[PDB]
Amino acid sequence: KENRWIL
Amino acid sequence: MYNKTVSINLDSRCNASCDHCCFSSSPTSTTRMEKEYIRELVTEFAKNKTIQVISFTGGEVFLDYKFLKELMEIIKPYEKQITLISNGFWGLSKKKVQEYFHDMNSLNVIALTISYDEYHAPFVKSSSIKNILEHSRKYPDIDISLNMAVTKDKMSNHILEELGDSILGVKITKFPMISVGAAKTRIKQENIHKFYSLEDEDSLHCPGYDIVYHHDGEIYPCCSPAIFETKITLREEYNQSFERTVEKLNSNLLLFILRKEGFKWFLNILKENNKIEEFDIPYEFSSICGVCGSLFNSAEKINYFYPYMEKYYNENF
Ligand SMILES: Nc1ncnc2c1ncn2[C@@H]1O[C@H](CSCC[C@H](N)C(=O)O)[C@@H](O)[C@H]1O
Ligand code: SF4
Ligand code: SF4
């Protein structure tokens, strides 16, 4: 989810 | 808890200058941690017994490939898994694509995410993206994904069509914008999708924590574009160990209350005290992170919750 957006 | 993965944002410098960029990355971006400091961080993360995955982000991590391969080679003896995210500018040459995939396969890179959409299109040709996506077929152990950032006026409908059959078998996810960085000023807010509102609080929950050592020298509890404009930081000193970062994440009162009570705990305090307009909290949002960003993007905002969090601690523990 959004917690790993930029990865 | 939250100690099996870690991310490092290598630099804010990028070959592209996307109009939505949460970091406002560009070829002239100067915000970054020193190379020697990053080497020490990577060495510690590789020697750490609990970390399994180390992720690299930017900025554009393939811009200084020599440094990226050097960091991946520090990790190599320790056998940790690596993830990479890129704009795929290097895909222009099939020979470079061959070289990088061979390196990634031998350096335990388990996932590669390529970002391509109408915001990235002025800086990277479609053919570069196609080259990377086609060659990935030869490396089934590397998880390949295509991330497309869209707005109502720039839905990337023609971009997928022009990628042709290169996208066959690739996981594609189109996602809305977080109104942060260049998206705040270069995109009309009416073009950002609104999926959530202050009313449907029942679905307002943080997806989870993922530690990132960011290019501004700070440490963040997640990798969402929204967190980088908040004052929620896990760093207390220049030389801080991963054990201390994890202990700080696990003892942070605001993050504990956020995880356990959801955004409604903070939103109800502001509604009850008539501070929704004073804090400029938006009515609608593209994502749950948009609420997070606006609740905690200033020291005044965070400090406002302190007496309430203090009361919560006394009452519950
Ligand atoms: N304001 C924003 N809202 C949502 N996604 C954003 C954003 N700013 C950047 N992103 C997305 O976050 C991801 C990581 S940005 C840094 C990694 C790399 N240069 C890249 O482009 O992949 C990209 O997929 C990018 O489109
Ligand atoms: S979204 Fe990625 S490619 Fe675009 S400017 Fe930001 S860091 Fe660079
Ligand atoms: S809700 Fe906040 S803490 Fe959770 S992932 Fe989104 S930005 Fe990060």
Side-chain angles (χ1 to χ4, degrees), chain B residues 30-274:
Chain B
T30 61
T31 316
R32 58 156 310 143
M33 293 180 286
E34 298 311 282
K35 283 201 168 175
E36 195 49 42
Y37 187 75
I38 294 166
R39 274 193 266 269
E40 294 167 5
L41 281 183
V42 168
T43 304
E44 176 204 10
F45 299 164
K47 293 172 179 175
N48 186 276
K49 294 304 203 69
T50 72
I51 291 163
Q52 293 172 14
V53 189
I54 303 172
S55 293
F56 293 105
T57 187
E60 179 48 44
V61 299
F62 290 77
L63 212 45
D64 182 352
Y65 189 70
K66 202 153 208 188
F67 183 57
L68 181 66
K69 185 176 191 271
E70 183 198 336
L71 296 186
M72 291 192 298
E73 246 137 20
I74 287 164
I75 300 164
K76 185 53 185 184
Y78 297 99
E79 306 197 331
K80 306 305 191 58
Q81 294 170 319
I82 300 177
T83 83
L84 301 174
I85 185 164
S86 181
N87 67 27
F89 82 92
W90 46 276
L92 184 74
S93 166
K94 276 176 186 158
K95 186 179 189 190
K96 269 251 161 301
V97 167
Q98 273 167 43
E99 181 195 338
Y100 291 4
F101 267 96
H102 173 88
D103 287 348
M104 284 185 291
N105 198 61
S106 60
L107 293 168
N108 308 144
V109 169
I110 64 164
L112 169 64
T113 296
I114 298 295
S115 302
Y116 200 56
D117 48 51
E118 301 184 42
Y119 292 89
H120 288 83
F123 314 101
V124 173
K125 279 171 202 165
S126 164
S127 58
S128 301
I129 310 296
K130 289 182 54 118
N131 288 344
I132 296 169
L133 302 181
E134 293 185 348
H135 200 60
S136 77
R137 298 198 190 107
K138 301 181 173 300
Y139 292 96
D141 301 330
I142 305 173
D143 191 38
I144 189 105
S145 307
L146 182 67
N147 272 12
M148 325 184 78
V150 299
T151 51
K152 301 177 169 176
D153 64 318
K154 286 178 193 291
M155 286 299 283
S156 297
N157 287 316
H158 321 293
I159 296 279
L160 275 189
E161 190 156 0
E162 168 53 59
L163 292 176
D165 67 26
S166 299
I167 58 149
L168 296 207
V170 170
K171 294 172 299 305
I172 300 154
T173 313
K174 292 192 178 179
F175 52 82
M177 304 300 183
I178 303 299
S179 193
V180 72
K184 257 148 62 201
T185 50
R186 300 193 225 156
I187 294 172
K188 300 195 198 324
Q189 303 304 295
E190 48 261 55
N191 285 323
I192 301 174
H193 305 80
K194 298 308 187 297
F195 292 129
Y196 306 93
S197 71
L198 284 184
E199 261 88 284
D200 51 60
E201 282 173 349
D202 291 343
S203 79
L204 302 180
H205 296 275
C206 167
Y209 301 139
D210 239 89
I211 301 173
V212 56
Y213 280 63
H214 197 220
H215 59 230
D216 64 359
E218 288 307 325
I219 308 166
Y220 296 89
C222 69
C223 302
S224 167
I227 208 66
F228 302 115
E229 273 188 15
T230 77
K231 301 297 165 312
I232 302 163
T233 188
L234 301 171
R235 182 173 303 277
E236 72 185 13
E237 68 177 298
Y238 195 62
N239 292 308
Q240 174 173 312
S241 70
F242 191 61
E243 285 80 4
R244 176 62 173 153
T245 294
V246 172
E247 180 193 18
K248 282 180 75 76
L249 173 56
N250 281 274
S251 51
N252 193 110
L253 194 50
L254 185 153
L255 298 171
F256 176 88
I257 297 171
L258 186 55
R259 166 70 41 239
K260 206 182 156 197
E261 310 292 340
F263 289 96
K264 81 187 188 323
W265 189 85
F266 301 90
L267 292 166
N268 288 349
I269 285 161
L270 303 181
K271 293 179 185 174
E272 246 176 333
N273 292 286
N274 309 302

